[PDB]
């Protein structure tokens, strides 16, 4: 399945939404660095 | 595999332009050295190099 299709299924069916994540000075480092 | 430990109690002084930024295997912030460096610890009685 193409990603485009899968992104649809997840929105229509399983409820996905790319909600915002507010992160600490340290967690941001973690996400970018690794 | 060897750990440089501290000679005595005190402030550690070095220039940070020479060293380059990194993240360690255990998750901590750290600096990586690719040139020789001199670090000094200023104990009240003496300076350790």
């Amino acid at each position: 399945e193409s990603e485009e299709e899968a992104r649809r299924k997840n929105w229509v069916d399983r409820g996905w939404a790319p909600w915002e994540e507010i992160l600490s000075p340290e967690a941001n480092f973690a996400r970018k660095s690794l | 595999a060897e750990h440089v430990r501290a000679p005595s109690n005190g402030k550690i002084k070095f220039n940070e332009d020479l060293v380059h930024p990194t993240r360690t295997r255990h998750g901590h912030p750290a600096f990586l050295c690719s040139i020789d460096l001199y670090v000094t610890i200023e104990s009240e009685d003496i300076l350790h190099n």
């Binding site: 992160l23 600490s24 340290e26 967690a27 480092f29 973690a30 690794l34 | 295997r25 255990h26 998750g27």
Partner: protein, 50 residues
């Protein structure tokens, strides 16, 4: 026989600096556990530090 060596409980000396060293290592380990929880470190990393 004349000198008579023997071993007692208080002859098993321990290095003077042990308490300070064990106490510090334990502090480092607690701090890393709070941080695994808060999301700033991963699991393979916790294992390794320990």
């Amino acid at each position: 026989t004349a000198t008579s060596i023997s071993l007692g409980i208080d002859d098993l000396l321990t290095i003077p600096s042990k308490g300070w060293l064990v106490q510090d290592a334990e502090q480092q380990s607690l701090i890393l556990e709070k941080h695994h929880h808060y999301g700033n470190v991963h699991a393979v990393e916790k294992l390794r530090q320990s």
